[PDB]
Ligand binder design. Structure first.
Ligand SMILES: CC(=O)O[C@H]1C(=O)[C@@]2(C)[C@H]([C@H](OC(=O)c3ccccc3)[C@]3(O)C[C@H](OC(=O)[C@H](O)[C@@H](NC(=O)c4ccccc4)c4ccccc4)C(C)=C1C3(C)C)[C@]1(OC(C)=O)CO[C@@H]1C[C@@H]2O
Ligand SMILES: CC(=O)O[C@H]1C(=O)[C@@]2(C)[C@H]([C@H](OC(=O)c3ccccc3)[C@]3(O)C[C@H](OC(=O)[C@H](O)[C@@H](NC(=O)c4ccccc4)c4ccccc4)C(C)=C1C3(C)C)[C@]1(OC(C)=O)CO[C@@H]1C[C@@H]2O
Ligand SMILES: Nc1nc2c(ncn2[C@@H]2O[C@H](COP(=O)(O)OP(=O)(O)OP(=O)(O)O)[C@@H](O)[C@H]2O)c(=O)[nH]1
Ligand SMILES: Nc1nc2c(ncn2[C@@H]2O[C@H](COP(=O)(O)OP(=O)(O)OP(=O)(O)O)[C@@H](O)[C@H]2O)c(=O)[nH]1
Ligand SMILES: Nc1nc2c(ncn2[C@@H]2O[C@H](COP(=O)(O)OP(=O)(O)O)[C@@H](O)[C@H]2O)c(=O)[nH]1
Ligand SMILES: Nc1nc2c(ncn2[C@@H]2O[C@H](COP(=O)(O)OP(=O)(O)O)[C@@H](O)[C@H]2O)c(=O)[nH]1
Ligand SMILES: [Mg+2]
Ligand SMILES: [Mg+2]
Lengths: 428, 86, 428, 428, 428
């Protein structure tokens, strides 16, 4: 009835996919061996002819090493090996390798698997992308994929959770290049785009959970909680349910501005949780705190074009409209003039689940926030500077023009970065 | 087709008409082996070959060539897309 | 996939590879009898990169050992791990080298290249997805410099797409174990620049100090120097061999390190390193591992990084840790000594990590950097070249093999241009 | 009442027969010794005076070296030796030696074996040939035989499952010669002729069952499955029972055009069978996949003059009506104007039976798609090319003219193909 | 059926025949006493191809031993496998051959053929379906060349339909153990071309290299050379003897290799060939066996394949393997070295396969190739002949047997006509 197709490209995508699909199989009683001892899982699973539940995901990569780990990991009895895709060679952080040379010869395999995956669903809500901008596979292939998707469906909605090159912490050297080439090529195809950065979540681990040893696992854990709270309306009951259709239309006013931030609350260990009572207000207050964001973007330098709140657990709608009224009275928050409204709130009755051996704690209340603000152009501006800072020197370019690219794409993508940045200014 | 093959076919027809009775194609001293074993049970003095009995079967032709392993190591070859062989 | 073919040229190259192929043979837990006796599955998961299958479940190294004067190939074959090499992978000629680059590259080269090329192709097809080549040189001698460059040129014209790494050992500024040393050096550098993608330059001098100060060695044999080179050469490919929350293929290191096709001369170093005493005092933490590698001693090449400027850099860690630590560590250094880095590159480092530690250790790292301080070496050798060439010392030997004087003039000029390039991007 | 005479000419013919007559005794419980512990087997057997069931087949060959293997295999108790024909000498890949010199002297023998076998059958549905084009026996003899058949019966139906010389993979150097000669003579004699080739099935074992070591025994098991599902209605119940007469009238609109392709689905191993549901929509889509064909032809390069479907297992007639409606909607598939219909379907309630030691897995559903498409003329154009490519040199012709043939037949076999090729173009 | 009679002419031919009969006698597992002591039934199914029954369960070879100077026939009788020959299958004369082709073919040959023909007729009629003949020449000596050809011409006009092989050892291009050797070569060739169907050519010089480089033999005696000729001579016929998924009679090898009646001089090679050391490391797969066979070294003839293109070739495998691999291997080779084949022949390799491997091995193969490289061999001889015939050296011996000069001039022109035909089809 109501189903989603979760895609995981690049290294980070198949990393978080291990976390989310750990969470879901845990939340619904699904054992690692396919079966559990309706529609509560059909949004994420397909009950086979008998017993087994296969997760309706897909894992794409050009490095065999990680998808091989899932094949030998505990969750090999879940994924039809038709889903786990790999490649003999990787992209090596070159956009053209993931986009022009190697990407082209394998998408026919992916779209085959996807065509085999959409026909099973009777009502397809939309695709769910987990991209990793800054690499050759995530940026190069992911962009190449979305074009193949929009030429196919178009009418379908495309949602994207992409990690964005953090300004300070930079594990790569060339990631401004392929990121620029990605954003341009993806924009006109994705209908909405959410971006998150690892460095912000690192700070989140420090203040709230207080873990001085944050690994890629813990970060992947938190994303699972966010998405589990989002899809909560799709796969559960609760007053003011939300679906992707009405969710997207009340959040993207203009076709270009679909770039949005996120936030989650509460985020607390098992000890601070005992000395707390967790009223809805403080959760919503923390959810609007700029520090509690997952991006290194300050919203207090722009305005909120719209906002959406997905609660969880025991909440009553009168507590919601009261707490939100505590926000719209505050001065530290700013909104654009052409929207008196801007809050699409949703409630669900199933509390958040916790993973044994995980970092979160058992709480009966939970809130995730997604807002569209014009301030995001600030972190967009940094990538604007860094590109020409190295493009004038034409550094690393001999790779691209040697890997089946030219110099126009640098200039062509360059203009649309300028073009987008002005659009974020025209809304002022 | 020819004389030799017609004689061949007649012999094979006889083989099929007769029941093979799952036979063992060699018969050793059955009751002598039983009697020798009974002599061993109490008298406690029997020749070794008298105690022995031997039975043979056809088994097969093709004298145990070693296995081909039908499969490489799952670190060299991958299916079409990354994936083991089975 | 990612199977790598290895070469060993000259006396030294044939000799260090004895250690390299001894260290790795114990990493993956195989015996001198060629059979595996480790414990985990992981030693078998990516074993394909360094070995081939054999009858009776044996693994032979995918190495090629080439050297005139086959006396030394008896040493390795009499070495405790010489039994694992395919005796058809032993190319040798009875006539000595003579330290003459010409005969090592003009007359005696042509006699063995046809044989070697039959060997290299005989196992280049054995790879499902050949990642690249790698070779261990000695620019002082006649086999190392002469043959390898001749061999390298031929490989480049049949596998141009692949990458050609180079663990060449450089002549010493102060010590000259031979006399005609600079000649073979320049005549090789005139070949390395055009037919290589990455060239690690190392010098036994710094290898002597690092043996002296840190490890507190009384008497370092050549087995210990090669023991170090074995470590770092086994430190590069932990990504292709082992899991990692952030893996790094060679081709992404290459793109992330050379912005220009001719700045492919690098500088390496290992971490940690300590005597038995302080090892009982020191603690293994990521701050330890990063200061010891960023220091100006561990640089195996006889160059001072403080005189130049880091164009790019990278770090390869192995051991369970928190990658944010690594992330913030590399961020600190890029801030403090901000003059040792360039401006037109915002983040000029790459921070990799592997989830598999060394055999007996539990944490370790490896450094690599493309600084312009390396041009100091090509300055030194250019003096030694021009001094004797000014007087045509030992020159009749070279003309004795059909060589002429022009080849010396251009080889000189090419270094002059090269060292000139390292000056431009070195704005002091 | 409803029985068939299955002939097996040539090595591949009797090889495939060693799989079909392996499958049938298991489909009906017949032990290898002729007897199990009505009309469910009469189509493929004939109960003797007491107990034994002889398979109403004929194993014919000129090479003794393979028939004598069934004569000593486990399946000798099944066959009366009067069935298995042999010969002192073979045809040696010469069409003339199979059709003119040697084949002429044993047809009178087999013709009496048939006459001794047709009389036992009350209602003779039709013959069932297993030709293997590309040899001397299958081509030269098989064609000579069918001539002797149409002069006897004429009104009876002569089927055929002819392996065709694959374009790329081919184990004969002269087989473009005999292939043309065979078709020039079989066409005007047979009334319907299935076509297939080896490599198209080699890939299927790699794509779908994922066995890297397929042998002739693997392909033979898959040809066994095609026929069983085809002939089940002749021996089983089920809605829309299909008979050879009603199978033939509505699939060959023109007398010359009778060649057709084949397909089968599902084709999956055991592990891929548990992560699935195998809806009737899945199979009919997999069945219509140009990659699931058994012949290396591109259907999208032509249209479908007519199609046919024999389902199996648990199906209901409405969903086929639904799924076939979905197929007529897609645009990749084309149909010529003068055929609005083109789907004559069929069901049986007996599932497909798997053989122990087989590669397929147990499924409660299956589809075998047969269709006469005008796209098939391309593979005829290959043989159309290679023939004149060699006949221009008159290569190997000394064998044919030396064995009771002349050049006339080549030229006369030539014209028939050009005439046949234009016929495939007259339909558009 | 398919029985074959075997002839041995000359000293060498009688010597390699002592091995061929010793190798085969062990394959089918019979004793030097002539009694059978094997284990399986495949030792007995087609034993009649090489033996006749004897009283008391003995097996004697269907061999004929023709040579003047009966001194050699005492040797083979005294060898460990001389007791199996019927001592009346020995035709000889006290007078010597003297390396004079004339007397071996005019005077002392005509005295014995009437007796030999009496012996070959006697056991030509001892075969139910005589497949063909096969001889063992030595184109240098007078017995092999002189008597062999005279015998062959007699057989041809008596058994035209049958097929005549010839394992003639050619003289060496560099080595000339005799002096009148080119006279014996050219004069024999004037007979073979019109009076044979397949003629392997083999040279001891290439047999020395193969024993030197590959086998690493220090002192290859004539036994080892004969041990290799024995190996291949058995490999040609395993189809006739053993079961095979794609059996290859000798008549179907003919038609697939000689497109024109005169181009019937082949080029042979065996594999696997390793020393005792390499046997431990090399693994036995189809890839190894096909690259080794397709190498220019395994060719036991003194001809370079790279100086020509394969008109046609054929590989014979024996050993339980997968037919798909051998099907694509011959495809790839046909693709890459497209210059080493012809255009008017689409597929110019035949890949037979047998089911039973050699005695102690598990996989093996044999290479046969009809390349235009052999034209070199005849070019060479045609000079040494025209060198001395221009001076009429040693010619008085040949006039001493009623010969003339026209016989030479016609003979030489026959080769120049022949080698001309090998150039026409070599378009370089
Ligand atoms: C009780 C204990 O911890 O002993 C250590 C040890 O104390 C020290 C001093 C080791 C030791 O190394 C040396 O003494 C040494 C001597 C000359 C040159 C280089 C090293 C050690 O030999 C080295 C050895 O390390 C390994 O085994 C690594 O996995 C290493 N293996 C080899 O080099 C090797 C040794 C034998 C045979 C084959 C390979 C390695 C390095 C890179 C990549 C893969 C593997 C270990 C833990 C130790 C001893 C034994 C003392 C050190 O070296 C290494 C390679 O770890 C020297 O500085 C480090 C710090 C270690 O703590
Ligand atoms: C432990 C083991 O496997 O030993 C092998 C062996 O190592 C090698 C080196 C054998 C060995 O062969 C030789 O040493 C050799 C010496 C001179 C000339 C030729 C061979 C072997 O003798 C050969 C022998 O092979 C056979 O028996 C073949 O079936 C062969 N037999 C004979 O030729 C033969 C006949 C009569 C008496 C003895 C041997 C054969 C080939 C074609 C058709 C029929 C039979 C075997 C398995 C071996 C040894 C003993 C070392 C090799 O020979 C063959 C034909 O198998 C040489 O290259 C192969 C590769 C084998 O691995
Ligand atoms: N928060 C978080 N970030 C991750 C994780 N895994 C990878 N990343 C980030 O992903 C970025 C690298 O992207 P990749 O997927 O490796 O690049 P690619 O597109 O696959 O291109 P190739 O490396 O050539 O295969 C790095 O900046 C990582 O910080 C994870 O598990 N959690
Ligand atoms: N699918 C399949 N194809 C086979 C098999 N065996 C042989 N073939 C192919 O059939 C063709 C030759 O068949 P044969 O029966 O040996 O030839 P023939 O008709 O007997 O003619 P002669 O060889 O002269 O006796 C070749 O293309 C083979 O690759 C098999 O077991 N399965
Ligand atoms: N790390 C290391 N370097 C060595 C070793 N032996 C020699 N070298 C250097 O190798 C240089 C000469 O190279 P060599 O191979 O002997 O000359 P070639 O045979 O003509 O190529 C000398 O300058 C040595 O310093 C060794 O054992 N270990
Ligand atoms: N493989 C092998 N070749 C031999 C042997 N003996 C001789 N040959 C060659 O056979 C040629 C001599 O032929 P031969 O039969 O002795 O003289 P003939 O009696 O006049 O025919 C010479 O080229 C020899 O080199 C042997 O024992 N083994
Ligand atoms: Mg990546
Ligand atoms: Mg055949």
């Amino acid at each position: 009835m109501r189903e989603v197709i979760s895609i995981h490209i690049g290294q980070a995508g198949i990393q978080v996919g291990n976390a989310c699909w750990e969470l879901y199989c845990l939340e619904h009683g699904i054992q690692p061996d396919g079966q559990m001892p309706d529609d509560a899982f059909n949004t994420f699973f397909s009950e086979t002819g008998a017993g087994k539940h296969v997760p309706r995901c897909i894992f794409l990569d050009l490095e065999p090493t990680v998808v091989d780990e899932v094949r030998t990991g505990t969750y090999r009895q879940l994924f039809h090996p038709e889903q786990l895709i790999s490649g003999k060679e990787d992209a090596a952080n070159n956009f053209a390798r993931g986009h022009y040379t190697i990407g082209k010869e394998i998408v026919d395999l992916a779209l085959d698997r996807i065509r085999k995956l959409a026909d099973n669903c009777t009502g397809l809500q939309g695709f769910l992308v987990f991209n990793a901008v800054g690499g050759g596979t995530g940026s190069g292939l992911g962009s190449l994929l979305l074009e193949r998707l929009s030429v196919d469906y178009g009418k379908k909605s495309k949602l994207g959770f992409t990690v964005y090159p953090s300004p300070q912490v930079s594990t790569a050297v060339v990631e401004p290049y392929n990121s620029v080439l990605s954003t341009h090529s993806l924009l006109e195809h994705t209908d909405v785009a959410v971006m998150l950065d690892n460095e912000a979540i690192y700070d989140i681990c420090r203040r709230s959970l207080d873990i001085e040893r944050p690994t890629y696992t813990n970060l992947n854990r938190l994303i699972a909680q966010v998405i589990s709270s989002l899809t909560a309306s799709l796969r559960f009951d609760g007053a003011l349910n939300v679906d992707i259709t009405e969710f997207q239309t009340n959040l993207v006013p203009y076709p270009r501005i679909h770039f949005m931030l996120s936030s989650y609350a509460p985020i607390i260990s098992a000890e601070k949780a005992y000395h707390e009572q967790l009223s809805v207000a403080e959760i919503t207050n923390a959810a609007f705190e700029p520090a509690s964001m997952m991006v290194k973007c300050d919203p207090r330098h722009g305005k909120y074009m719209a906002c959406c709140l997905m609660y969880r657990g025991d909440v009553v709608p009168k507590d919601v409209n009261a707490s939100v009224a505590t926000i719209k009275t505050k001065r530290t928050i700013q909104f654009v003039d052409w929207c008196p409204t801007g809050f699409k709130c949703g409630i669900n009755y199933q509390p958040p689940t916790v993973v044994p051996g995980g970092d979160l704690a058992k709480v009966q209340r939970a809130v995730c926030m997604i807002s569209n603000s014009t301030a995001i152009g600030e972190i967009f501006s940094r990538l604007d500077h860094k590109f020409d800072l190295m493009y004038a020197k034409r550094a690393f370019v001999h790779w691209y023009v040697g890997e089946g690219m030219e110099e126009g794409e640098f200039s062509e993508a360059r203009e649309d970065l300028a073009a987008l940045e002005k659009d974020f200014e025209e809304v002022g | 087709m020819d004389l030799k093959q017609q004689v061949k076919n007649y012999t094979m027809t006889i083989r099929n008409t007769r029941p093979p009775t799952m036979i063992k194609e060699q018969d050793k001293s059955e009751f002598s082996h039983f009697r020798a074993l009974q002599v061993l049970a109490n008298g406690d003095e029997v020749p070794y070959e008298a105690t022995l009995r031997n039975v043979i079967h056809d088994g097969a032709r093709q004298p145990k060539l070693p296995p081909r392993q039908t499969q490489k190591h799952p670190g060299y070859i991958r299916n079409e897309s990354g994936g083991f062989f089975t | 996939m990612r199977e790598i073919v290895h070469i060993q040229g000259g006396q030294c190259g044939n000799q260090i590879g004895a250690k390299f192929w001894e260290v790795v043979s114990d990493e993956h837990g195989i015996d001198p009898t060629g059979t595996y006796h480790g414990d985990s599955d992981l030693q078998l998961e990516r074993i394909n990169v360094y070995f081939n299958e054999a009858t009776g479940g044996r693994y032979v190294p995918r190495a090629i050992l080439m050297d005139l004067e086959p006396g030394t190939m008896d040493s390795v074959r009499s070495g405790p791990y010489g039994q694992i090499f395919r005796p058809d992978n032993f190319v040798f000629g009875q006539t000595g080298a003579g330290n003459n680059w010409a005969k090592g590259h003009y007359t005696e080269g042509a006699e063995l290249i046809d044989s070697v090329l039959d060997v290299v192709r005989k196992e280049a097809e054995s790879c499902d997805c050949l990642q690249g080549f790698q070779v261990c040189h000695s620019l002082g001698g006649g086999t190392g410099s002469g043959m390898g460059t001749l061999l390298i040129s031929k490989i480049r014209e049949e596998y141009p797409d692949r990458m050609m790494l180079t663990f060449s050992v450089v002549p010493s500024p102060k010590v000259s174990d031979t006399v005609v040393e600079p000649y073979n050096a320049t005549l090789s550098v005139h070949q390395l620049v055009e037919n290589a993608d990455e060239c690690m330059v190392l010098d036994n001098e710094a290898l002597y100090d690092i043996c002296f100060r840190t490890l507190k060695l009384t008497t370092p044999t050549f087995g210990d120097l090669n023991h170090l080179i074995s470590a770092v050469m086994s430190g590069i490919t932990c990504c292709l061999r082992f899991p990692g929350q952030l893996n790094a293929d060679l081709r992404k290191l290459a793109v992330n390190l050379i912005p220009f096709p001719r700045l492919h001369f690098f500088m390496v170093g290992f971490t940690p390193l300590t005597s038995r005493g302080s090892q009982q005092y020191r603690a293994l933490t990521v701050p330890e591992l990063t200061q010891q590698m960023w220091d100006a001693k561990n640089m195996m090449c006889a160059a001072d990084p403080r005189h130049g400027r880091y164009l790019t850099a990278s770090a390869l860690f192995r051991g369970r840790m928190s990658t944010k630590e690594v992330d913030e560590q590399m961020l600190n250094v890029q801030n403090k000594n901000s003059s040792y880095f360039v401006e037109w590159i915002p983040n000029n480092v790459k921070s990799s990590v592997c989830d598999i530690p060394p055999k007996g250790l539990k944490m370790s790292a490896t450094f690599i950097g493309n600084s312009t301080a390396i041009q100091e070496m090509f300055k030194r050798v250019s003096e030694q070249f021009t001094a004797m060439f000014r007087r045509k010392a030992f020159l009749h030997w070279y003309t004795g093999e059909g060589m002429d004087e022009m080849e010396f003039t251009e080889a000189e000029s090419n270094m002059n241009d090269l060292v000139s390039e390292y000056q431009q991007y070195q704005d002091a």
